[PDB]
């Protein structure tokens, strides 16, 4: 079940809306970077509003895809992190300081535009 | 399930899968619910990645557009492929009422302009 990526002008929009799977997150990390490279988008906003909990594997995947996307030249934003997910990100801890984070998808896109 | 994004007062659904008849009704049921929950005035359905479609799914696509109008939301279809265009015409669903655009951004633009 590939997770979709939306291209809106110069931004990539992602919304995860189900329990993530180790095998799925790896495909998502693989797919997002290709989409950045194929489209040359300036910014990505990843929505985890519908993600109840995550594992350490996903946490590392999520942290790496933020770091990798920035290297390819795209500023990244996370939105909708729930308390359960926030705890696991802190506990590894993949709460990278350079994580620009937002409360909601709209706000993240707003923050994304003002950064650029 | 098919994910649906909410940007301000608009719904963006992109179908990057291969949709069977089972998924289409799930989509129809979920989209009409999403409008009612969100209070969205417009929705953009991107069919750019849909290689082909069948007559049954064609019909649900036409019903979704017309049903969402009744709820008060405007529907724009984007990225329809030639193969899909043949099937849509074949059923006769293709009406002047269907508002359509080439890609998601143009479809979203057409939406804001008419609201």
Domains in chain A (CATH in brackets) are 1-116 (3.30.750.24)
DSSP string, A12-36: EEEE--S---HHHHHHHHHHHHHHH
List of residues 6+ apart from A35 with CB closer than 8 A: A5, A7, A12, A41
In the sheet that holds A6-8, the strands lie side by side as A6-8, A11-15, A43-47, A75-79, A101-102
Nearest to A13, CA basis, from B18, B40, B104: B104
Q: This structure's resolution (angstroms)?
A: 3.1
Residue labelled with tokens 């290689």:
B51
Cβ within 8 Å, pair B105-A9? yes
User: Obtained via which technique?
Assistant: X-ray
Cα of B104 to nearest chain A Cα, Å: 7
Nearest to B3, CA basis, from A74, A13, A34: A13
Cβ within 8 Å, pair B1-A17? yes
Task: Tell me which chain A residues have a C-beta less than 8 angstroms from the C-beta of B108.
Answer: 8
At residue A10, φ and ψ (nearest 5 deg) are: -95, 10
CA distance B115 to B112: 5
Cα of A78 to nearest chain B Cα, Å: 15
Q: In this complex, is the C-beta atom of A22 within 8 Å of any C-beta atom belonging to chain B?
A: no
Structure tokens at B23: 């998924």
């Amino acid at each position: 079940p590939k997770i979709p990526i939306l291209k809106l002008y110069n931004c990539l929009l992602v919304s995860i809306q189900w329990e993530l799977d180790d095998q799925t997150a790896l495909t998502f990390q693989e797919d997002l970077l290709n989409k950045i490279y194929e489209t040359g988008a300036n910014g990505v906003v990843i929505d985890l509003t519908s993600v109840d909990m995550i594992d350490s594997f996903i946490a590392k995947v999520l942290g790496d895809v933020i770091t990798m996307s920035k290297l390819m030249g795209a500023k990244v934003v996370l939105t909708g992190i729930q308390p359960a997910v926030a705890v696991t990100l802190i506990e590894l801890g993949i709460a990278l300081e350079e994580i620009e984070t937002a409360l909601d998808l709209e706000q993240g896109l707003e923050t994304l535009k003002r950064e650029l």
